[PDB]
Nucleic acid binder design. Structure first.
Ligand SMILES: [Zn+2]
Length: 362
DNA sequence: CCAGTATTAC
DNA sequence: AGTAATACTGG
């Protein structure tokens, strides 16, 4: 279609030789564990405690997910293998079958429903160490120490138990440590202070915070592999709220959505995407890379920026800002947004051919 | 056997 | 701390 041209990316993180190399990816996003822990407390959660989470502006959507939530990661890996080298730092783009797909804060909000508005002024000063100092010796607080303390606390007049549950939720789902066990990494210091203030925790843009944390994991992952995927059974951790990334490829590519996604009946059309769809069950715990690659086939039907539906416009207006945040100057991405703005699609024929060849003919 | 996962070891 | 290896889970 005639129109302004999209420039090819200055580089890619991996060559197409790596598109068939599988990998075990370890998540750090303990949705199932947190929900199970909450349901199994010997002293059950109070109505106020339960409604804090079930009515939380962001975290209410974690309850619209299937029980025993299990992440499926080969869609994300397929995208990771096609990450473009760009100048922007606040968004990532993946080139599938020659078509750039964007993971920005808007997409993170559309799928999660989490508040992705701008940070309030001097948010880093929120809360204080008083609450944590009431329950943890000076030193390192591990994610498991918060879980243990939560299960060993007695519900009573003060909301300290609710604060602990909030801390557990934040540091298991939103900003989550990689290392576990006896020497587990210290949990996020901001979350420890923020959990002291339940009102602040209800309004803070945890969508932006989880998004920025996921951007860090993406960069660490790409640096780690440095262009080559090893032949190993050792899993690589990609910590943080990865649900938008797990579903992104399926939401942007109809061939994948049709074969691997099903509508979640009972869901409200006002909810974000994660509450309205679910992965179809297969004979395996997750989809294999070969399955994703095969269903990818030769399709050219791919949305660069996943489009919202009418029933979702109020939600996005409620959880996103009006203008995009300032980022580094990026003439390549600029050319993409120009061509997309004119109503034209983007597909680099050569890149498309290499993707198809790498997946289906060698 | 598998992909996702929890846990210890290097 | 950062990373890698082992082996369990629910099929
Ligand atoms: Zn929802």
């Amino acid at each position: 279609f005639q129109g302004s041209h999209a420039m090819q990316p200055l580089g890619m993180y991996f060559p197409a030789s790596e598109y068939t190399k599988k990998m075990k990816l370890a998540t750090r996003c303990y949705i199932s564990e947190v929900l199970k822990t909450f349901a199994d407390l010997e002293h059950p959660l109070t109505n106020v405690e339960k409604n804090y989470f079930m009515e939380h502006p962001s975290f209410k959507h974690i309850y619209h997910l299937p029980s025993g939530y299990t992440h499926k990661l080969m869609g994300m890996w397929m995208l990771f293998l096609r990450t473009a080298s760009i100048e922007k730092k606040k968004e990532v783009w993946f080139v599938v079958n020659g078509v750039p797909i964007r993971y920005g804060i808007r997409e993170h909000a559309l799928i999660s429903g989490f508040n992705c508005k701008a940070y309030p002024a001097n948010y880093q000063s929120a809360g204080n160490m008083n609450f944590a100092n009431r329950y943890f010796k000076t030193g390192v607080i591990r994610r498991e120490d918060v879980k243990t303390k939560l299960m060993e606390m007695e519900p009573a007049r003060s909301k300290d138990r609710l604060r602990m549950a909030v801390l557990y939720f934040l540091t298991s789902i939103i900003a989550v440590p990689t290392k576990t066990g006896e020497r587990a990494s210290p949990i996020d210091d901001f979350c420890v202070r923020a959990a002291s203030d339940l009102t602040f925790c209800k309004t803070f843009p945890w969508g932006r915070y989880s998004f920025e944390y996921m951007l860090k994991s993406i960069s660490h992952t790409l640096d780690h592999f440095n262009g080559v995927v090893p032949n190993t059974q050792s899993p690589w951790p990609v910590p943080g709220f990865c649900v938008p990334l797990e579903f992104l490829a399926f939401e942007a590519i109809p061939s994948l959505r049709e074969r691997f996604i099903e509508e979640k009946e009972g869901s409200h059309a006002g909810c974000p995407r994660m509450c309205k769809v679910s992965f179809k069950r297969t004979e395996m715990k997750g989809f294999t890379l070969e399955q994703i690659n095969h269903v990818l086939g030769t399709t050219e039907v791919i949305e660069s920026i996943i489009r919202e539906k009418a029933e979702e416009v109020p939600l996005l207006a409620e959880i996103t800002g009006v203008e995009d945040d300032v980022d580094k100057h990026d003439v390549v991405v600029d050319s993409w947004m120009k061509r997309l703005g004119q109503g034209r699609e983007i597909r680099f024929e050569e890149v498309y051919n290499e993707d198809v060849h790498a997946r289906m003919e060698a």
